[model samples]
Target: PVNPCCYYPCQHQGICVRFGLDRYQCDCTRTGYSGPNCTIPEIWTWLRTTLRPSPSFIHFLLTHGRWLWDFVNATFIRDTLMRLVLTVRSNLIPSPPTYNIAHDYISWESFSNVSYYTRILPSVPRDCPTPMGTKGKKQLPDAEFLSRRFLLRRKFIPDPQGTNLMFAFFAQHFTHQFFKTSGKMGPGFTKALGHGVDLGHIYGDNLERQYQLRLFKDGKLKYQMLNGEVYPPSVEEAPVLMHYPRGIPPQSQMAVGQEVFGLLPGLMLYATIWLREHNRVCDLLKAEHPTWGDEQLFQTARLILIGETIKIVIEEYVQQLSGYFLQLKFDPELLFGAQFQYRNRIAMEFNQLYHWHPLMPDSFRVGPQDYSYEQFLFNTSMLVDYGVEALVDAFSRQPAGRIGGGRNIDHHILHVAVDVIKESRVLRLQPFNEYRKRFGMKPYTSFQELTGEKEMAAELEELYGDIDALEFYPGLLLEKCHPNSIFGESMIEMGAPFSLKGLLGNPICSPEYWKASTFGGEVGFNLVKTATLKKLVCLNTKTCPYVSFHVPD
Candidate 1:
C-alpha cells in the first residue's frame, strides 16, 4: 500500500526516494540528465529541436537543402500543429464546443456584440488577491514593485532579432483588428466585433461605419490632402470618435476605424497607407472595367485590398514572427480538404498573449528631434507634422525594446502591467503550466526551467510556492524566450495554434472564396500573391526609402 516507487516512476536509471506517503523525488544527480523525472538531457540537445520530421532532417532543411521546405517541412509542421490544436479544441469547455458559429446564421442573436470570448483551457479558480483588495496582498509581489523590478527600462534594449519600430507598429495596427477590449465591459468580454482579420482598423467593422469613412464615389475612403500628402479626412470633417488631448488641434485628429489610432502617429500612419491603397486600387479597377460604376468598383477593390492585407500579414509578418527556416507561405489550398474547424473566434487567452508594451521603446528621434514616450502618447499630429515618409524612416531606423523580462517596459506604462496582472484574477484564467499542457507542450518541471534567469526563478519560486501556482500573465512574460525568437516559449506555443487556426480559417481561405473571381480577376489574385510589407510601404509613399521588418546592422 506504500510502494510509491514500486512502479519505477524515475527514468534513465535515476534513484527515486519516497519522502512521504505517495510522495517521491527522483534523484537525477548522476543520470547526466535533469528534470523531476530525469527524462530530459542536461545539455538540452533533446529540447531545442522539438519540431517534427526528425532533428537531422530539420537541420538539413535549415542548413543546406530548403528549396522545397515550404512544400515539405512547412506543410508537415503546420498540419501537425493544427492537428494538435484540433485535439485541444475537441475537449474545450465553457462555450460552444466548436470553434466557429454557423456561416449562414444571420440574426442579432448570432451576429450581435453578445458572443463571449472563449478559452484555450477551462477556467481554474484561484484564491488570489483581488484587484481592489488589500487583504492577502503580501502573498504576491506588489504590482508597483513588479512593474519597477521587471517592467521599467533602465536603458534601451533592442530586439535581438533586429526587429525595428516599423515591425512593432505594424503588429500593433494589425492586432487592433480583432483583439479589441473594453475596460468598462470587464475582463471576460471583447468588444465582440467580427473576429476575422477583416481590416476593421481602416474600413470599419460594419457597413454603416464603413459608409461614414467612404466618399461613396470611385469606391474610395474619404481622404484630405495636407501639404500634398494624402491622409484620412480630419476628424473635423467626419463624426470620427477620437481622444483629442486638451492642446492638440482639431485638424490633427484622424478619422479612422479604431478610435485609438487617433492617439498614436504610427497607427494613423498605417491607417493612412491602407486608405491610400484602397483608393489607388479603385482606379485600377476602373481602368479594367470602364462600364463599372462606383458600387462595383468599390466592392471589387475592397475585396482585393483585403486579400492583399491578409497575404502580407501571413507571408511577411507571421513568417518573421515564427523565426522558422521552413519558408512559410500564404497558400490556402493546403487546407482545402482538411477536416479541421474553420470557425473564427478570438480566445480570451489569445488577446492576453499580445500584451507587448515592451515593443515600445522609451524614446527615439526624428531628424535630431528626440521624442520621449510621453510625447508619443495622444500625439496624432506627429504624423502630419513630420510627414509619413519621415515617420516611416524614423520608425524603421529606431529599434524596439526586448519583450517581457526584467527592465524592459518603460515606467510610463506601469499601470498596464498592474492592470493585466489584476485582470487575470478577474477572469480566473488557468495557470501557466496548465496552458502548456493544453497546447501539447510539456509542463515546466521547475521554476528554473520556466525562467532562465536565476534570480527571477528564485523570486518566482518564493512568490508562487509551486510552479503550478504561477499565474498565466506573469508566467507568460517571465518565461524564457527561445533562441532568436522575439516571444517567450510559452507565448509562441500557445499563440501559434490560435494564430494558425484563425489565419487558415479566414472566410477568404474557404474553397469557394479563394478563387480569382472573388478578388476581381487574375491581376487582383496576382496582386494579393505578390503583396509584401516592403512593397506596401514603397508603393504607397511618394519616394520610398529603405523599409524592412529587421534593421540592417
Candidate 2:
C-alpha cells in the first residue's frame, strides 16, 4: 500500500506520470526559462518598473501632473554620467544646438533675437556702435547702466555645514569633459568634436588611423602600459606613467583648450595617478584570462577604466557637490532602456551656465603645509621637480577652496572664464529676451518684472533700453542662485543643459560591454573596484604615507 504521492511528483507545472520506475524530468527544456524549477522572469514587470521612460507621454504627463496650472514640478535630476556615450548612430561631427531647430524644441533661443542687431552685426565692421573692447570708463552711463556689468560677489553665509572639496574638484574636471569651443582665431574651424572624447578620441581629416593614436597594443585593441605599478611611493621620480599622454610633437600645437594637461603640474599629477590605475587593471585582466587575446583584454580594461571614472565622479563627486539632502543615486537601470537623441551635443549655453569660477581658490596649495603660492604658482616646476610624493602629501591634508567669502569681484575670481566669453563673442548677437523665449520661459513684459534684484532690473533696462538688447550670459549671471540648485531659478529654467545624461547610449555603461564573461569573473571586477585615487597614490608613491582621497572639508 504505497502512498499516492510517493512517486511521479513535480514541483512546478509539469505533468507527472509513472514513466518507468521513479525517474522523472522537468517539462522545461533547453529553451526559454530553463532554471532548476522552470522559473520565467518577469518581462513586463521589468518593462514597467526598470526600463527608463521616453518623453512621448511627457506633454500629457506634464498636463496631468498639475504644473501647467498650479505649476508644481518634479525634480529633473541625474548624476553627471558617462564620458563619451555613443548615441543611436555613430557621430564624428560636433553638432551643438542650432538656432533654427533647437528653438523649436529641446533647447531655447532663435535667429529672431539677432534679427534687429543683424545690420550692425555683419554690416561694414559689423560692430554696430557698442565698443566691446573697452572695459569700463568708455561705456559710462547712469547708475542703472553702471550696475549692469555683472558681478561675481563672494558668498557671505557659509553652508551651515563646513565647506566641502567636491564642488571645486568637479568644476575643474567636469568642465574638462564638456564644452571645447573653436580656436580663438581658427579661420577654418569646422564643427570639431573638441578633443574627440564625445567621438572616442577620433580627430583630424576623415576619421581614420591617420589622425588616431596608434594605441601601443600589440593586438591594437588592448593599450600598451608601463611595466608594474607606478614607481612605488617614490623618494625620487614622479611615477612616469600617463593616461593617453600628450604624444604629439610640441611644435605641432597651436590654439587653446584643455588638451594640454602638462602646463599645470597640478593637472599633470592628476593624470599620472589615473594612468597608474589603468595599467594595474590591464595587467590584472591579462592574468585572469591568460588565453584571451590582447583585443579582448584591452577592450575590457578600457571599459572598466571609464566605468571606474564614472563611478568616482557620481558616487563620490556629484553626491557631495549636490546638497546632502537631494539624495542623488546612480541607478544601473538607466543603462538599458532610455531613449536618447543623436542631436544632443554639448551646447554653447550650457558652457555659459557653469558658475564654478568662484570656487577656484586664489592659489594652489601643494600639501598641508606648503602655503606659499609664489614658490609654486610662478614656477609649478616643483610639482614634478619637487617629485610626486611631496605634492601628493600636500593636497591630501589640505582642503580645497571655498565658494563663498562675500565681497565681490567686478568680474570673476577666475577672470579667465569671463575673458573668454568676451573674446569668443559667443552670444554677442543674441539678447537675454531671445534666450528667455528660447529657454521656454515667458519673456518679461518689461525690465521692471525681470528679476528679484531691483538694481539689476533697473540696470538691465537702462543699458539696453529695450529688453531685446541685453546680451545673454550677462543677464544669466545677474540672475540669483539659491541653495542646492545649479543656479538661481533663472539659470535652472534657462538654457542650462548642464552635463552628461546618456546611460543607454554610452558603451561604457551598457551590458553590451560589461558581461560576467566579458569582465572575466571576479578577477577583473575586483581589480577595477579596488582601483581609486587613494589606492593609486598609496600603491605608486614611496614617501607619501597617507593619502586622503576622500573630500576633506
The best candidate by lDDT is 1
lDDT per residue, candidate 1, 63-115, as tens digits?
A: 34446545556467755544443344322222232221222112344334445
Task: Please write out the lDDT profile of model 2 over residues 1-553, one tens digit for every residue.
Answer: 2221222122222222334553435454422334444445346534543464432233234225343323221233323222112221122112342332123222234322321111101111123333222122224233222322444443422233233332344345435544444455231122334221332321111234212322344222212222332321211122122222244322212111124444445554554554445556666777766787766665666566555665555555544443333333433444345544323344445455554454444445554444444544324345445566666655554444323222233232446545534632433333455455433355566655655557767765666566555555555655544442333444544321233332223444455555556566777665545545555566655554445433354
Q: Residue 419 error for model 1, in Å?
A: 1.0
Question: For each candidate, what TM-score against the reference?
Answer: 0.80, 0.57
**Consecutive 10-residue window with the lowest summed lDDT within model 2:** 116-125
Candidate 2, TM-score vs. the true structure?
A: 0.57
Go through the candidates in order and give the clash count of each: 0, 11
Query: What is candidate 1's CA lDDT for residue 302?
Result: 77
Question: Where is model 2 more than 4 Å wrong at Cα?
Answer: 1-149, 152-170, 184-258, 292-296, 341-344, 367-378, 385-415, 423-457, 466-469, 484-487, 490-498, 502-505, 514-553
| Cα lDDT over the full model 1 | 0.69
Q: 501 in model 2: Cα distance from truth in Å?
A: 2.4
